[PDB]
């Protein structure tokens, strides 16, 4: 927190490193989430092309997002206010232990421009010793940032549930999430899952003429990095996406709706080749619900925490 580094440190030529840092935070209570935005200082179109952690030994999750519309103007807030008041992007997430893993080469996220992101927004989430006097935080994250348009962009394909209802009891409840797609060919190396507490697993796959291959699949209550995709997925016109989240209502007292409450996304993050991409694209409704009949039976095996 006496660090000189200063928001903006040109590189070369044609790229700048933003230093994204908590203004001096005090995480009081546990499972504290604090946010902050930070604009981008060009107008025109930039690539994101690198991130660098710089967490403490208390610092439990961060998130990146990009948006035009931070949820407030504050030196930093709570995410519980809300992180963006329009689409929050999410751009990176960092998990203590989880390797975070690394923008393929030659990817970069579009921000800036008429079309990108204005901003960043970083939350920072705790996981605290009781005495320390007041002690200053100044977490978060490095990006490398440049203006040398990149071959392949990155992207978010967002699968979100909406129509399910958890009676209490159940113990098997499962949400599925479908969607033709329709664009140029979108490539998968990450994936990150969300849920509340009641998930048990999520899983995604893309579907070929019948046939399934995982795209990722993992427990809800582990921590919601992005996990890497073993082998790139090719997502191509005429597939279908389709992701199942397994909920239990076991313990509850009544029934638990998909919203804001119980939700199920996940989060597949993309490259495509620069020419045919964009940067975000949703799934929202389950149009083959058939297909989940043949849905392979390890979407159904559990993952212990
Ligand atoms: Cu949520």
Same mark, same amino acid.
């Given at each position: 927190?006496? #660090?000189?580094?200063?928001?903006?440190?040109?590189?070369?030529?044609? +790229?700048?490193?933003?230093?994204?840092?908590?203004?001096?935070?005090?995480?009081? *209570?546990?499972?504290?989430?604090?946010? $902050?935005?930070?604009? %981008?200082?060009?107008?025109?179109?930039?690539?994101?092309?690198?991130?660098?952690?710089?967490?403490?030994?208390?610092?439990?999750?961060? %998130?990146?997002?990009?948006?035009?519309?931070?949820?407030?103007?504050?030196?930093?807030?709570?995410?519980? *206010?809300?992180?963006?008041?329009?689409?929050?992007?999410?751009? =990176?997430?960092?998990?203590?232990?989880?390797?975070?893993?690394?923008?393929?080469?030659?990817?970069?996220?579009?921000?800036?421009?008429?079309?990108?992101?204005?901003?960043?927004?970083?939350?920072?989430? =705790? #996981?605290?010793?009781?005495?320390?006097?007041?002690?200053? +935080?100044?977490?978060?994250?490095?990006?490398?940032?440049?203006? !040398?348009?990149?071959?392949?962009?990155? #992207?978010?394909?967002?699968?979100?549930?909406? +129509?399910?209802?958890?009676?209490?009891? *159940?113990? !098997?409840?499962?949400?599925?999430?479908?969607?033709?797609?329709?664009?140029?060919?979108?490539?998968?190396?990450?994936?990150?899952?969300?849920?509340?507490?009641?998930?048990?697993?999520?899983?995604? =796959?893309?579907?070929?003429?019948?046939?399934?291959?995982?795209?990722?699949?993992?427990?809800?209550?582990?921590?919601?990095?992005?996990?890497?995709?073993?082998?790139?997925?090719?997502?191509?016109?005429?597939?279908?996406?389709?992701?199942?989240?397994?909920?239990?209502? *076991?313990?509850?007292?009544?029934?638990?709706?998909?919203?804001?409450?119980?939700?199920?996304? %996940?989060?597949? $993050?993309?490259?495509?080749?620069?020419?045919?991409?964009?940067?975000?694209?949703?799934?929202?409704?389950?149009?083959?619900?058939? $297909?989940?009949?043949?849905?392979?039976?390890?979407?159904?095996?559990?993952?212990?925490?």
């Amino acid at each position: 927190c006496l #660090g000189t580094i200063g928001p903006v440190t040109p590189l070369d030529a044609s +790229d700048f490193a933003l230093d994204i840092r908590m203004p001096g935070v005090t995480p009081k *209570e546990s499972d504290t989430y604090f946010c $902050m935005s930070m604009r %981008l200082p060009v107008d025109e179109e930039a690539f994101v092309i690198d991130f660098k952690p710089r967490a403490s030994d208390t610092v439990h999750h961060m %998130l990146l997002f990009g948006c035009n519309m931070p949820s407030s103007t504050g030196s930093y807030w709570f995410c519980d *206010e809300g992180t963006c008041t329009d689409k929050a992007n999410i751009l =990176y997430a960092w998990a203590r232990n989880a390797p975070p893993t690394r923008l393929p080469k030659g990817v970069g996220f579009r921000v800036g421009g008429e079309t990108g992101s204005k901003y960043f927004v970083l939350q920072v989430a =705790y #996981g605290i010793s009781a005495f320390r006097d007041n002690h200053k +935080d100044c977490s978060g994250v490095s990006v490398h940032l440049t203006r !040398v348009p990149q071959p392949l962009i990155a #992207g978010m394909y967002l699968m979100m549930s909406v +129509d399910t209802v958890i009676p209490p009891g *159940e113990k !098997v409840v499962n949400a599925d999430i479908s969607c033709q797609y329709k664009m140029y060919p979108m490539h998968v190396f990450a994936y990150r899952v969300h849920t509340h507490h009641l998930g048990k697993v999520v899983s995604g =796959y893309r579907v070929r003429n019948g046939q399934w291959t995982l795209i990722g699949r993992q427990n809800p209550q582990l921590p919601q990095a992005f996990y890497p995709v073993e082998h790139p997925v090719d997502v191509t016109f005429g597939d279908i996406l389709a992701a199942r989240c397994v909920f239990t209502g *076991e313990g509850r007292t009544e029934a638990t709706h998909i919203g804001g409450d119980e939700m199920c996304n %996940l989060y597949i $993050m993309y490259y495509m080749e620069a020419k045919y991409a964009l940067s975000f694209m949703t799934c929202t409704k389950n149009v083959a619900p058939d $297909m989940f009949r043949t849905i392979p039976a390890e979407a159904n095996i559990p993952i212990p925490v």
